Amino acid sequence: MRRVVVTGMGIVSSIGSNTEEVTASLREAKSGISRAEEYAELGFRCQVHGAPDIDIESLVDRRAMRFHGRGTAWNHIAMDQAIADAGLTEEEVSNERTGIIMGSGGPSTRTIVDSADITREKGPKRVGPFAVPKAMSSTASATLATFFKIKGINYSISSACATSNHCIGNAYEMIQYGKQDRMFAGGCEDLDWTLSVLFDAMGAMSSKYNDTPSTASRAYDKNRDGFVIAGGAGVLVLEDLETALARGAKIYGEIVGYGATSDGYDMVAPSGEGAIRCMKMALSTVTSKIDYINPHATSTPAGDAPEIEAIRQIFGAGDVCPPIAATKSLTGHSLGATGVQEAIYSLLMMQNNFICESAHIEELDPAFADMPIVRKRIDNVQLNTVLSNSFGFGGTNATLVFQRYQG
Amino acid sequence: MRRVVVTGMGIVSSIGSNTEEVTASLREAKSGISRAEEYAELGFRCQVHGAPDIDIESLVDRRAMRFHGRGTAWNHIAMDQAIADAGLTEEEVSNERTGIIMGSGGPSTRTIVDSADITREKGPKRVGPFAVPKAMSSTASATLATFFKIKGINYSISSACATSNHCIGNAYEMIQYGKQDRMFAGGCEDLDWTLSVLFDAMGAMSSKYNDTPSTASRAYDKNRDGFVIAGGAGVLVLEDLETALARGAKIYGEIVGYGATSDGYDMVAPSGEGAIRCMKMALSTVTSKIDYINPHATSTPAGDAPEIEAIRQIFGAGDVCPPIAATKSLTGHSLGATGVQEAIYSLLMMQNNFICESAHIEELDPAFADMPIVRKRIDNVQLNTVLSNSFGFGGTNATLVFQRYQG
Numbered sequence: 001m002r003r004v005v006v007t008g009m010g011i012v013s014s015i016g017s018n019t020e021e022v023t024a025s026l027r028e029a030k031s032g033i034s035r036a037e038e039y040a041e042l043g044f045r046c047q048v049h050g051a052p053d054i055d056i057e058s059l060v061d062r063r064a065m066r067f068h069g070r071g072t073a074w075n076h077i078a079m080d081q082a083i084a085d086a087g088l089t090e091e092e093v094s095n096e097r098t099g100i101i102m103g104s105g106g107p108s109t110r111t112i113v114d115s116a117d118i119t120r121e122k123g124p125k126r127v128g129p130f131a132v133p134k135a136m137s138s139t140a141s142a143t144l145a146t147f148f149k150i151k152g153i154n155y156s157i158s159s160a161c162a163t164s165n166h167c168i169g170n171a172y173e174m175i176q177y178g179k180q181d182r183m184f185a186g187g188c189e190d191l192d193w194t195l196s197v198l199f200d201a202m203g204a205m206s207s208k209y210n211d212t213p214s215t216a217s218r219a220y221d222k223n224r225d226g227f228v229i230a231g232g233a234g235v236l237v238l239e240d241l242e243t244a245l246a247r248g249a250k251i252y253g254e255i256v257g258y259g260a261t262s263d264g265y266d267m268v269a270p271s272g273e274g275a276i277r278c279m280k281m282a283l284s285t286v287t288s289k290i291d292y293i294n295p296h297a298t299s300t301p302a303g304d305a306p307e308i309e310a311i312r313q314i315f316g317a318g319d320v321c322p323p324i325a326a327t328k329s330l331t332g333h334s335l336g337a338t339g340v341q342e343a344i345y346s347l348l349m350m351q352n353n354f355i356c357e358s359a360h361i362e363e364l365d366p367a368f369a370d371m372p373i374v375r376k377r378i379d380n381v382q383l384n385t386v387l388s389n390s391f392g393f394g395g396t397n398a399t400l401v402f403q404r405y406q407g
Numbered sequence: 408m409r410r411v412v413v414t415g416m417g418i419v420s421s422i423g424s425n426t427e428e429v430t431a432s433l434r435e436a437k438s439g440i441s442r443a444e445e446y447a448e449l450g451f452r453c454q455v456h457g458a459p460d461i462d463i464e465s466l467v468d469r470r471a472m473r474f475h476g477r478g479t480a481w482n483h484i485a486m487d488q489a490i491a492d493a494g495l496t497e498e499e500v501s502n503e504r505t506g507i508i509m510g511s512g513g514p515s516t517r518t519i520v521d522s523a524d525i526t527r528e529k530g531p532k533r534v535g536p537f538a539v540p541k542a543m544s545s546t547a548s549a550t551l552a553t554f555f556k557i558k559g560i561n562y563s564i565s566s567a568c569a570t571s572n573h574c575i576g577n578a579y580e581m582i583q584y585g586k587q588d589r590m591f592a593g594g595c596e597d598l599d600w601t602l603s604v605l606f607d608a609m610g611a612m613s614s615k616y617n618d619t620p621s622t623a624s625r626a627y628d629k630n631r632d633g634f635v636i637a638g639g640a641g642v643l644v645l646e647d648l649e650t651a652l653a654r655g656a657k658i659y660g661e662i663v664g665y666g667a668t669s670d671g672y673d674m675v676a677p678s679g680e681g682a683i684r685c686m687k688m689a690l691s692t693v694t695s696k697i698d699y700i701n702p703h704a705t706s707t708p709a710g711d712a713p714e715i716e717a718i719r720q721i722f723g724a725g726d727v728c729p730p731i732a733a734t735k736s737l738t739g740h741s742l743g744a745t746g747v748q749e750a751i752y753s754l755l756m757m758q759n760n761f762i763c764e765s766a767h768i769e770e771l772d773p774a775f776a777d778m779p780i781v782r783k784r785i786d787n788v789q790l791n792t793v794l795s796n797s798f799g800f801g802g803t804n805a806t807l808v809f810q811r812y813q814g
């Protein structure tokens with residue numbers, strides 16, 4: 001099986017509109033979370049969100065936008081960034097050996113709702129002719145494959161909050177097994193009340209911190225009370241090692257493990273044992289110690305702990321365990337986009353020799369007092385191997401491991 | 408790479424609620440298409456649909472239904488059928504070597520719309536706590552993985568109308584490459600005005616035959632005027648050959664090829680050349696002649712022809728070309744569910760030694776007069792190898808080839 005490397009990255013995030021802005025936010029623990037006044041207007045309990053700040057119309061032209069939801073438009077931007085970063089020619093983007101696996105947690109729920117509303121108010125014709133590619137679950141792959149003239153693999157993986165981790169893993173497999181030489185992988189999510197309300201109604205999102213929105217997302221804090229929802233996108237360019245070397249690619253890291261498992265337990269809560277099996281599977285092909293763990297940790301009361309226990313079972317406790325820092329405390333939870341964004345955060349930390357603070361821990365939950373959760377940024381650290389988990393409703397688990405390429 | 412066989416099938420279709428009913432419909436060319444009065448009430452142009460007739464509440468209990476949309480409930484039924492057909496024990500369903508890749512074209516659009524409506528009418532809390540797993544794009548895998556206690560792979564592929572063909576293909580790859588020994592693969596789609604209107608607004612669905620609904624879907628007819636939308640589900644049980652043999656499995660067929668490509672051309676129309684490359688890729692590993700082609704052919708004016716041209720380029724014309732019969736003329740177009748349902752139709756035709764009529768051709772489009780489109784059921788035919796295409800918006804292509812297992 002061939003080796004697979006990351007040669008370009010692109011990102012639209014609550015903590016920055018490119019990798020430079022994101023790096024600065026991670027380094028300085030600058031929260032991306034703000035008050036969502038619209039949610040207050042609609043009567044939500046949770047009134048906080050992690051919103052990108054980026055001018056779409058300046059970066060994607062009107063004709064491309066014809067078939068984009070906001071999430072996939074952010075994905076388009078991230079794709080442009082990743083192609084530029086990688087330095088690809090048009091020929092390298094558009095060829096039979098180059099594909100795309102790009103997903104989202106949901107489609108454009110706003111398109112679905114607006115279409116239903118206008119059907120009832122003004123008639124079906126007034127839905128307009130461009131709604132299907134926004135409303136279908138493949139929207140992220142469909143739009144980008146068409147606009148970037150992708151000729152190889154073209155589909156989306158959907159796995160709720162694991163989505164873009166699986167997208168990367170399956171793209172990794174496609175290259176390992178020789179079917180493709182280059183893949184664009186990642187995903188996106190719109191940020192919209194029509195999705196967010198589904199989580200508010202289940203009591204899944206933070207509401208105790210509405211008066212201090214910036215600190216509402218606080219994985220591992222004793223008084224965490226739900227995740228904070230976010231939108232955005234991320235893209236990695238993946239290539240087989242020989243293809244990358246031959247064209248003088250920048251190598252951000254090598255993908256060296258991937259796990260994917262299923263809990264078979266509860267629809268909306270994790271079992272823990274599925275995560276253990278997932279991490280073991282990702283680690284089974286890894287031959288160095290892990291220097292940093294980017295957990296799934298979303299700041300829910302019932303979510304953060306089973307993952308820590310799974311980590312304990314694999315890695316042990318205290319100094320022997322790798323440092324753990326939950327980036328969702330800064331970024332919120334971008335659902336479909338979170339796996340790829342966390343891969344990018346981890347690869348940027350590797351590049352810049354620091355591990356970010358696990359932010360907004362005002363009082364550590366004592367159940368985690370034995371674990372090396374990062375309370376202050378760690379500088380001048382040589383990260384060679386990093387692990388990132390993502391999990392999703394329906395008991396779906398994905399883990400990726402990336403390594404500094406040294407030959 | 409290991410060999411992979413189909414050992415069980417399940418289906419909920421506009422042309423039957425199990426494989427027996429479906430076989431009878433195919434044999435007798437009994438249309439599943441009816442008037443959709445609701446679409447007339449809402450002011451649609453198209454007023455026809457392909458609706459399942461099955462009593463969900465009698466087949467899936469209330470607690471399972473908590474997290475099901477209608478599409479995934481139909482998928483649950485099909486899963487139960489496939490497990491029964493395969494004769495699997497509980498242990499064979501729930502184990503680390505057994506996974507699920509199950510998808511839909513969209514999530515429950517009805518859940519999304521109802522939730523938005525009730526938020527605005529009665530408040531966010533009244534959305535209730537069970538909406539996320541219905542509204543997320545992974546709904547088909549999430550629900551079934553949780554209820555059937557799946558422990559291995561768990562995710563959805565989404566690729567619009569190619570969805571369940573890719574789901575089968577990727578499951579096939581997982582087994583070929585040794586990662587899993589058994590997979591449940593397929594998909595589903597709800598049938599609901601909140602999805603169907605998106606296609607009516609683009610003028611994609613048949614409207615000239617509203618007064619004769621049963622014949623509205625008519626692939627290859629000169630006067631075809633759009634597809635006819637449908638809902639339902641299908642599931643295949645896939646196993647590595649040694650696993651199947653060792654337990655005395657029924658073998659419906661062997662998966663012997665899979666292609667997946669991308670047009671990189673137009674959002675909502677096919678290029679043709681992508682389909683050629685897709686079929687060549689599926690055929691590259693096939694060492695017998697094709698005895699039957701189940702086309703994607705949806706009865707659109709601009710869709711049916713580029714596929715026929717691609718078939719011409721690969722297979723030639725007239726007697727040398729394999730017989731072609733478009734099952735969508737009977738079934739309509741179940742979007743996410745159509746790939747797996749067409750695999751099941753093809754495997755049932757193989758089992759029963761007939762090729763169904765390509766229905767509702769009252770006047771053959773002269774552009775296809777050189778092609779062996781089946782005008783009357785062919786009996787007493789030995790099908791050993793069959794090919795099925797599915798394509799989707801966003802230029803996404805998937806082809807599968809199945810073969811009678813003879814050692």
Ligand SMILES: C=C1C[C@@]23C=CC(=O)[C@@](C)(CCC(=O)Nc4c(O)ccc(C(=O)O)c4O)[C@@H]2C[C@@H]1CC3
Nearest residue numbers: 161203204268269270298300301302303391392393
């Ligand atoms: C049945 C319950 C109990 C309840 C109690 C405490 C909780 O923490 C939540 C809110 C979320 C559990 C969880 O982390 N799921 C969970 C999960 O398995 C996988 C992923 C995520 C994610 O956010 O990415 C996730 O969130 C659950 C969900 C629902 C309502 C309250």
Ligand SMILES: C=C1C[C@@]23C=CC(=O)[C@@](C)(CCC(=O)Nc4c(O)ccc(C(=O)O)c4O)[C@@H]2C[C@@H]1CC3
Nearest residue numbers: 568610611675676677705707708709710798799800
């Ligand atoms: C820009 C146009 C021209 C127009 C003219 C004639 C047509 O036939 C349709 C309606 C559909 C083309 C098509 O088959 N797409 C198409 C496709 O590429 C892939 C899959 C399917 C499918 O149904 O599964 C499909 O339907 C197109 C779509 C849109 C409006 C009218």
